[PDB]
Amino acid sequence: IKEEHTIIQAEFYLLPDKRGEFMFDFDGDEIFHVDIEKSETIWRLEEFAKFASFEAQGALANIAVDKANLDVMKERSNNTPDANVAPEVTVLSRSPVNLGEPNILICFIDKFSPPVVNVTWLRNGRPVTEGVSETVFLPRDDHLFRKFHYLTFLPSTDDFYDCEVDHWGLEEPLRKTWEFEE
Amino acid sequence: RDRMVNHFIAEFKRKGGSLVPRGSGGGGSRPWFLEYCKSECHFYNGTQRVRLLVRYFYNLEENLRFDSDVGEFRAVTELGRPDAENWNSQPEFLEQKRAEVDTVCRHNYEIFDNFLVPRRVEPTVTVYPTKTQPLEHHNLLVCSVSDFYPGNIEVRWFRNGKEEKTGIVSTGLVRNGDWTFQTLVMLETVPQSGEVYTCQVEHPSLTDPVTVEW
Numbered sequence: 001i002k003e004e005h006t007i008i009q010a011e012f013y014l015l016p017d018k019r020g021e022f023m024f025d026f027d028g029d030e031i032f033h034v035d036i037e038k039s040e041t042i043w044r045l046e047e048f049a050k051f052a053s054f055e056a057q058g059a060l061a062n063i064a065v066d067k068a069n070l071d072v073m074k075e076r077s078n079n080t081p082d083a084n085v086a087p088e089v090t091v092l093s094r095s096p097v098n099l100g101e102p103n104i105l106i107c108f109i110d111k112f113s114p115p116v117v118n119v120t121w122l123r124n125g126r127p128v129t130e131g132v133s134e135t136v137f138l139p140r141d142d143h144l145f146r147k148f149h150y151l152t153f154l155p156s157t158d159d160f161y162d163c164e165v166d167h168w169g170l171e172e173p174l175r176k177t178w179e180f181e182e
Numbered sequence: 183r184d185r186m187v188n189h190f191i192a193e194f195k196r197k198g199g200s201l202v203p204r205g206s207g208g209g210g211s212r213p214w215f216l217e218y219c220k221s222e223c224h225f226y227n228g229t230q231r232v233r234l235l236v237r238y239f240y241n242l243e244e245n246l247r248f249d250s251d252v253g254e255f256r257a258v259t260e261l262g263r264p265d266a267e268n269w270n271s272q273p274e275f276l277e278q279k280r281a282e283v284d285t286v287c288r289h290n291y292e293i294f295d296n297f298l299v300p301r302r303v304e305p306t307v308t309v310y311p312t313k314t315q316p317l318e319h320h321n322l323l324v325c326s327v328s329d330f331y332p333g334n335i336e337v338r339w340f341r342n343g344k345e346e347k348t349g350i351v352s353t354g355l356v357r358n359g360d361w362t363f364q365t366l367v368m369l370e371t372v373p374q375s376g377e378v379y380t381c382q383v384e385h386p387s388l389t390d391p392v393t394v395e396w
């Protein structure tokens with residue numbers, strides 16, 4: 001056999017928002033990421049924590065330099081702020097949707113930049129704050145970002161769901177609707 | 183449990199001069215400035231042969247990179263050159279990056295080969311039609327293959343015997359972000375009596391193929 005894999009250490013620092021990021025990718029999936037604020041390693045899947053350990057200070061230090069560099073870079077190009085590339089959204093179930101059996105709706109915001117979005121899940125018109133989770137800003141092969149959003153939902157014949165994505169590159173927030181169909 | 187994961191260390195970019203800018207889009211666009219970097223450890227066959235590739239961005243474009251194969255930084259665009267030249271003049275830095283194929287790329291592989299590499303999860307295979315009532319075009323036989331990992335897999339729809347190599351509407355490999363894939367391989371057909379459809383799924387968590395007739 002032959003093992004083909006790619007580990008990526010992606011980090012960034014973004015102004016004006018003053019928000020950085022330091023994470024590792026394994027064949028496309030987040031191995032983990034550091035919480036630059038709380039200063040802690042957040043494995044993608046908790047089971048990982050029992051196999052490796054990343055001293056979260058390490059990240060904080062690199063972001064410190066990436067903070068510096070951005071001021072260098074921003075000066076080297078006349079503080080010319082590039083354009084904003086509106087993200088592409090798509091709501092899909094995490095597994096086959098049977099009526100009554102718990103599932104999850106994945107809200108995949110893809111191909112965007114800058115790395116900042118406002119995503120909202122709506123169940124039957126109202127915003128849902130419980131049973132919702134999101135991933136950090138994930139890398140792509142290119143220079144753009146993708147980021148996943150999840151909402152635990154009970155496959156009902158009565159409901160409907162929406163994902164609302166608002167990005168500095170959209171005229172009006174985007175809203176993809178999902179809804180059981182049978 | 184293995185060792186502690188290493189990371190690539192960031193270097194301050196010597197400011198440099200100033201380049202006369204190309205442009206920036208507006209019209210519903212707010213000003214932003216992003217310094218972004220990607221250090222890609224590429225393993226062709228485990229740690230046998232590895233290729234490092236550090237890619238420095240800035241806003242919407244890659245402007246400088248460090249290929250293992252080339253051995254020095256290269257300007258991808260003009261904005262990156264001031265750096266490519268400076269870092270390239272720092273002999274000590276150039277060896278650092280050069281040693282990173284090891285101190286970082288391999289050191290971390292080795293660790294990850296213990297849990298990440300061998301991670302396997304069998305796919306829950308599922309067959310069913312999208313039977314409406316009319317349509318005429320005919321409701322496609324949906325072979326949903328969910329929750330599997332690694333990505334690579336092969337899902338084949340068979341028409342009673344032979345590999346019905348056509349009308350295979352597919353989603354392709356979908357990635358959920360929680361380390362689980364899935365894919366629906368839908369067959370466009372007209373379900374009729376005396377004929378059972380089959381879904382043959384081969385995967386690195388399956389010694390033998392999973393087949394679901396319908």
Ligand SMILES: *[C@@H]1O[C@H](CO)[C@@H](O)[C@H](O)[C@H]1NC(C)=O
Pocket residue numbers: 001002003227228229230
């Ligand atoms: C890949 O590496 C393994 C050991 O890690 C060994 O079989 C050989 O070096 C390579 N195998 C193939 C099939 O290339």
Ligand SMILES: *[C@@H]1O[C@H](CO)[C@@H](O)[C@H](O)[C@H]1NC(C)=O
Pocket residue numbers: 078079
């Ligand atoms: C150039 O960079 C300066 C930073 O001092 C900024 O104020 C100005 O708007 C930029 N554009 C031009 C055309 O000078």
Ligand SMILES: *[C@H]1O[C@H](CO)[C@@H](O)[C@H](O)[C@H]1NC(C)=O
Pocket residue numbers: 116117118166167168
């Ligand atoms: C919505 O999010 C922020 C607050 O988190 C708000 O100030 C801004 O108008 C919107 N952000 C984006 C990235 O569009």
